[PDB]
Design a protein around this nucleic acid. Structure first.
Ligand SMILES: [Zn+2]
Ligand SMILES: [Zn+2]
Ligand SMILES: [Zn+2]
Ligand SMILES: [Zn+2]
Lengths: 89, 89
DNA sequence: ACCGGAGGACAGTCCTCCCGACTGACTGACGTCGTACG
DNA sequence: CGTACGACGTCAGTCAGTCGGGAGGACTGTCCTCCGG
């Protein structure tokens, strides 16, 4: 089943043979089969672990700071910004 | 297709007839077909939105509580109590 | 009766991969200028 | 001097190649019902 890295990236049929394969072989490229990427399980128990801890950190957050701040953090991607937020106390 | 509240809790086969079904007519029972109860979507995109929020709060709380059992706190249910606690900031 | 879990239709993932559109390059054709000849 | 021919340059059109939206579909895991112990 698994297509080689390059065929994946390019989205063309892979011959998939061993070691290399038609277009990496032909075209002159180093053909690889990368490991599947580890992702979190998409189960319902796990979505619920995570929604319900996020909820409880939100509940605790609100005893400490205003709701308007909740909404800012819940969007920040930068670690300086998450820290500065906290520094304006 | 939908089974009745009761056949649902008792786990027996439901006749499904409306308004009152098999048993619920028999045992002269309060027969409800309660509406289809919502869950949040199990999709990858939504698992991931929620995991990004949780990470950001998780990070914000590493700085509020650099010292431990945040989990102790996360389990409490009382608002006064939690706030009595935190005022040991 | 009661309820753990089998059974199965279904929701949605998460792969590989075919196909269409868009961009770039190459070739051809036309037009304009310059030179040569009358 | 004037006209004609050739050569070069520029523009347009067509073809090919590549990134991309996403169809196809096996599969993971859900989430019902209700069997039978
Ligand atoms: Zn390949
Ligand atoms: Zn390859
Ligand atoms: Zn019923
Ligand atoms: Zn009923």
């Amino acid at each position: 089943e698994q297509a080689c890295d390059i065929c994946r990236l390019k989205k063309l049929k892979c011959s998939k043979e061993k070691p290399k394969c038609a277009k990496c072989l032909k075209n002159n490229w180093e053909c690889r089969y990368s490991p599947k990427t580890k992702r979190s399980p998409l189960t319902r128990a796990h979505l619920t672990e995570v929604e319900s801890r996020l909820e409880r950190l939100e509940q605790l957050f609100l005893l400490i700071f205003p709701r308007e701040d909740l909404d800012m953090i819940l969007k920040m991607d930068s670690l300086q910004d998450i820290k500065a937020l906290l520094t304006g106390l």
